[PDB]
C-alpha cells in the first residue's frame, strides 16, 4: 500500500513515486535517490541500520510537502524513506517532485532533501567489522 509520504522497510520501488506526481500539466519530474555508500571510512561499511519514529516521520515528510507547496505552488511531492538494514547502494531515501517547468522541480527537490536531514525523526547506525555507531547531526 503506497502513501504520498511514507516509511517503508522493503526495498524502495521507484516508479510509483514518479507516477504519483505525474499529471497532464506536469512537464518535469525530478527524482532524487540517496544511496548507501561504501568507503566513507577506512574500515569497510558492512551495511547500515535505519530506524524511524514512523508516525512522526511521516507527519514531518508531509510537512515538507506542505512547505514545498507554499514555496513552489504547482509542484507535487512524494517522499519515502526506508528503514531496517540497508545494503551498499540500496536506496535509503527517494524524493519525487513534479512541476509544469523544470526549474521548480529541481529547486523543490533539493530543498526537500535538506529539510529531511534537518527535521525528520530518522536515524542511521553504521555497522562495520567489530563495531557500530549511531550517526548524529
Amino acid at each position: 500500500h503506497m502513501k504520498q509520504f511514507e516509511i517503508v522497510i522493503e526495498p524502495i520501488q521507484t516508479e510509483q513515486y514518479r507516477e504519483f506526481t505525474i499529471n497532464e500539466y506536469q512537464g518535469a519530474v525530478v527524482v532524487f535517490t540517496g544511496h548507501v555508500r561504501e568507503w566513507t571510512k577506512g574500515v569497510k561499511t558492512e551495511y547500515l541500520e535505519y530506524e524511524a519514529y514512523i508516525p512522526m516521520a511521516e507527519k514531518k515528510l508531509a510537512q515538507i510537502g506542505d512547505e514545498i507547496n507554499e514555496k513552489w505552488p504547482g509542484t507535487i511531492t512524494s517522499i519515502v524513506h526506508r528503514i531496517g538494514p540497508l545494503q551498499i547502494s540500496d536506496i535509503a531515501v527517494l524524493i519525487a517532485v513534479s512541476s509544469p517547468h523544470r526549474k521548480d522541480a529541481y529547486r523543490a527537490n533539493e530543498y526537500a532533501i535538506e529539510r529531511i536531514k534537518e527535521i525528520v525523526p530518522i536515524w542511521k547506525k553504521e555497522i562495520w567489522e567489530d563495531g557500530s555507531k549511531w550517526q548524529g547531526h
Binding site: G34, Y53, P55, I116, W123, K124, G136
Partner: protein, 77 residues
C-alpha cells in the same frame, strides 16, 4: 503515559518502550528529571522530546495518557 526510545538511547536502555502510570499531568522538565533519575546512564545524551508526535519544550505539559518520545539528533536522508 507511554514512553518511546530510539537509536542510541534505545540501545543503552535495552528497551524500545515503557509505560509509566500517571495520576496527573507532568511537566516536560519533570519528565526529564524522572528519566535521568531512573537512567543516569543517559543523563549526558542529547535529545528533543515529542509528545503525541509533536516536538515540545521543557515548559510544556504531558497528560497522563500521552505518548512521549525521546528524539536524538536526527541522521536521516
Amino acid at each position: 503515559m507511554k514512553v518511546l526510545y530510539f537509536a542510541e538511547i534505545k540501545d543503552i536502555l535495552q528497551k524500545a518502550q515503557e509505560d509509566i502510570v500517571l495520576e496527573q499531568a507532568l511537566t516536560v522538565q519533570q519528565f526529564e528529571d524522572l528519566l535521568f533519575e531512573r537512567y543516569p546512564q543517559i543523563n549526558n545524551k542529547k535529545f528533543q522530546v515529542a509528545v503525541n508526535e509533536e516536538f515540545v519544550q521543557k515548559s510544556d505539559f504531558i497528560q497522563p495518557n500521552d505518548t512521549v518520545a525521546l528524539i536524538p539528533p536526527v541522521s536521516g536522508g
